[PDB]
Design a binder for this molecule. Structure first.
Ligand SMILES: Nc1nc2c(ncn2[C@@H]2O[C@H](COP(=O)(O)OP(=O)(O)NP(=O)(O)O)[C@@H](O)[C@H]2O)c(=O)[nH]1
Ligand SMILES: [Mg+2]
Length: 154
């Protein structure tokens, strides 16, 4: 089965680890839980085609698709997205790389990132935007499956 090398990036504490651990282990994780592990591999079926997700929970040169994650309660994490995107562009030597913008922690009752700004940022990039919660599992499978679809269409 084809392997898809997925890389999860974004500012500190945005939920990169917790997004991946929710997908794999069906558990919302916090600081009292281990988030040391490098990579996670998981057999899935996406669009009736089996595949293996090889997920690196942050070298990036080999990655085939990237989740750029910010937290909707951390404006600086959203401002920093452009920095991660430019980093990925540099190491992949490409203006366009399979990539999904993830606004995580969408369970929280409050927020500091205007959602309309997130849609427009992603539109300027030409990439999907997905709102996720590692806590409730909202958007989690969609974020990763959407990235795989982006890679297949590259
Ligand atoms: N409410 C809420 N809290 C979340 C969500 N995702 C992560 N958190 C919380 O945010 C904190 C950071 O989570 P973590 O997964 O370690 O983020 P990280 O980006 O991997 N951090 P690091 O860059 O240091 O590895 C933890 O307390 C975690 O429980 C979410 O979707 N909703
Ligand atoms: Mg982490």
């Amino acid at each position: 089965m084809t392997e898809y090398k997925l890389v999860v990036v974004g500012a500190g504490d945005v939920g990169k680890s917790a997004l991946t651990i929710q997908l794999i282990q069906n558990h919302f994780v916090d600081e009292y839980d281990p988030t040391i592990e490098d990579s996670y591999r998981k057999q899935v079926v996406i669009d009736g085609e089996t595949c293996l997700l090889d997920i690196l929970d942050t070298y990036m040169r080999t990655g085939e698709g990237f989740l750029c994650v910010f937290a909707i309660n951390n404006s600086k994490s959203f401002a920093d997205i452009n920095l991660y995107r430019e980093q990925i562009k540099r190491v992949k030597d490409s203006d366009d790389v399979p990539m999904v913008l993830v606004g995580n922690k969408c369970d929280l009752p409050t927020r500091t990132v205007d959602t309309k700004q997130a849609h427009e940022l992603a539109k300027s990039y030409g990439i999907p935007f997905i709102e996720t919660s590692a806590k409730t599992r909202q958007g989690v499978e969609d974020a990763f499956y959407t990235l795989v679809r982006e890679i297949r269409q590259y």
